[PDB]
Amino acid sequence: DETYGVNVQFESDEEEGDEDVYGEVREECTLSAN
Amino acid sequence: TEPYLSSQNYGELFSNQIIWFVDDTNVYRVTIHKTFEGNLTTKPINGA
Amino acid sequence: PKGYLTDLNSMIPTHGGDINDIKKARLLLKSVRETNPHHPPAWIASARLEEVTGKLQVARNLIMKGTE
């Protein structure tokens, strides 16, 4: 489909507490003298 | 904060006190148009 | 330093973009894909803007958000 004509909404969203979103523990030559 | 316009408070829309609705969702709208070889454009179009 | 500056000049982007308008279009397509989650070209345009500039892993996570 073309779907020509689609709204946008500029918001000041995404305010949170700066912890993890889902409350999970997300874990992921040398010197020589001669 | 005023009682939001529910489906049991909308009957107050039609008394003598003149009421407006402001729908600002469709103000900023775009069209996302592809040509296959090269790149993809997004044209901001007019809103209401 | 000569060879390392030669290699730094070898990695400059010729199609990086216009950085303030790149940020503006990033904000724009972010608002598109946030208010239209079920629009396919929103996710395509967001990931294409994040593959033409920046780095690719955020674009790859954006399309794996878009595919689901």
UniProtKB/Swiss-Prot annotation, chain A:
Cellular compartments annotated: Nucleus
Tissue: Widely expressed.
Subunit structure: Component of a core complex containing at least PRPF8, SNRNP200, EFTUD2 and SNRNP40. Component of the U5 snRNP and U4/U6-U5 tri-snRNP complexes, building blocks of the spliceosome. Component of the U4/U6-U5 tri-snRNP complex composed of the U4, U6 and U5 snRNAs and at least PRPF3, PRPF4, PRPF6, PRPF8, PRPF31, SNRNP200, TXNL4A, SNRNP40, DDX23, CD2BP2, PPIH, SNU13, EFTUD2, SART1 and USP39. Component of precatalytic, catalytic and postcatalytic spliceosomal complexes. Component of the minor spliceosome, which splices U12-type introns.
Protein role: Catalyzes the ATP-dependent unwinding of U4/U6 RNA duplices, an essential step in the assembly of a catalytically active spliceosome. Plays a role in pre-mRNA splicing as a core component of precatalytic, catalytic and postcatalytic spliceosomal complexes. As a component of the minor spliceosome, involved in the splicing of U12-type introns in pre-mRNAs. Involved in spliceosome assembly, activation and disassembly. Mediates changes in the dynamic network of RNA-RNA interactions in the spliceosome.
Clinical condition linked: Retinitis pigmentosa 33: A retinal dystrophy belonging to the group of pigmentary retinopathies. Retinitis pigmentosa is characterized by retinal pigment deposits visible on fundus examination and primary loss of rod photoreceptor cells followed by secondary loss of cone photoreceptors. Patients typically have night vision blindness and loss of midperipheral visual field. As their condition progresses, they lose their far peripheral visual field and eventually central vision as well.
Family membership noted in the UniProt record: Belongs to the helicase family. SKI2 subfamily.
Protein name stated in the entry: U5 small nuclear ribonucleoprotein 200 kDa helicase
Protein source organism: Homo sapiens
From Swiss-Prot, chain B:
Distribution of this protein across tissues and organs: Widely expressed.
Highest taxon above the source species: Eukaryota
Cell compartments where the protein resides: Nucleus; Nucleus speckle
Physiological role: Plays a role in pre-mRNA splicing as core component of precatalytic, catalytic and postcatalytic spliceosomal complexes, both of the predominant U2-type spliceosome and the minor U12-type spliceosome. Functions as a scaffold that mediates the ordered assembly of spliceosomal proteins and snRNAs. Required for the assembly of the U4/U6-U5 tri-snRNP complex, a building block of the spliceosome. Functions as a scaffold that positions spliceosomal U2, U5 and U6 snRNAs at splice sites on pre-mRNA substrates, so that splicing can occur. Interacts with both the 5' and the 3' splice site.
Quaternary state and interactors: Part of the U5 snRNP complex. Component of the U4/U6-U5 tri-snRNP complex composed of the U4, U6 and U5 snRNAs and at least PRPF3, PRPF4, PRPF6, PRPF8, PRPF31, SNRNP200, TXNL4A, SNRNP40, DDX23, CD2BP2, PPIH, SNU13, EFTUD2, SART1 and USP39. Component of the U5.U4atac/U6atac snRNP complexes in U12-dependent spliceosomes. Within the minor spliceosome, which acts on U12-type introns, interacts with PPIL2 and RBM48. Core component of U2-type precatalytic, catalytic and postcatalytic spliceosomal complexes. Found in a mRNA splicing-dependent exon junction complex (EJC) with SRRM1.
Domain notes: The MPN (JAB/Mov34) domain mediates interaction with TSSC4 and SNRNP200. Has structural similarity with deubiquitinating enzymes, but lacks the residues that would bind the catalytic metal ion. Contains a region with structural similarity to reverse transcriptase, presenting the classical thumb, fingers and palm architecture, but lacks enzyme activity, since the essential metal-binding residues are not conserved.
Native species: Homo sapiens
Swiss-Prot record, chain C:
Tissue specificity remark: Widely expressed.
Annotated positions of the Phosphothreonine modification: T6
Localization in the cell: Nucleus, Nucleoplasm; Nucleus speckle
Post-translational modification: Phosphorylated by PRP4K during spliceosome assembly.
Highest taxon of the lineage: Eukaryota
Positions of post-translational Phosphoserine modification: S10
Signal peptide segment: none
Assembly with partners or alone: Identified in the spliceosome B complex. Identified in the spliceosome C complex. Associates with the U5 snRNP particle. Component of the U4/U6-U5 tri-snRNP complex composed of the U4, U6 and U5 snRNAs and at least PRPF3, PRPF4, PRPF6, PRPF8, PRPF31, SNRNP200, TXNL4A, SNRNP40, DDX23, CD2BP2, PPIH, SNU13, EFTUD2, SART1 and USP39, LSm proteins LSm2-8 and Sm proteins. Interacts with ARAF. Interacts with AR and NR3C1, but not ESR1, independently of the presence of hormones. Interacts with USH1G.
Function, in words: Involved in pre-mRNA splicing as component of the U4/U6-U5 tri-snRNP complex, one of the building blocks of the spliceosome. Enhances dihydrotestosterone-induced transactivation activity of AR, as well as dexamethasone-induced transactivation activity of NR3C1, but does not affect estrogen-induced transactivation.
Disease implicated: Retinitis pigmentosa 60: A retinal dystrophy belonging to the group of pigmentary retinopathies. Retinitis pigmentosa is characterized by retinal pigment deposits visible on fundus examination and primary loss of rod photoreceptor cells followed by secondary loss of cone photoreceptors. Patients typically have night vision blindness and loss of midperipheral visual field. As their condition progresses, they lose their far peripheral visual field and eventually central vision as well.
Protein name per Swiss-Prot or TrEMBL: Pre-mRNA-processing factor 6
Organism expressing this protein natively: Homo sapiens
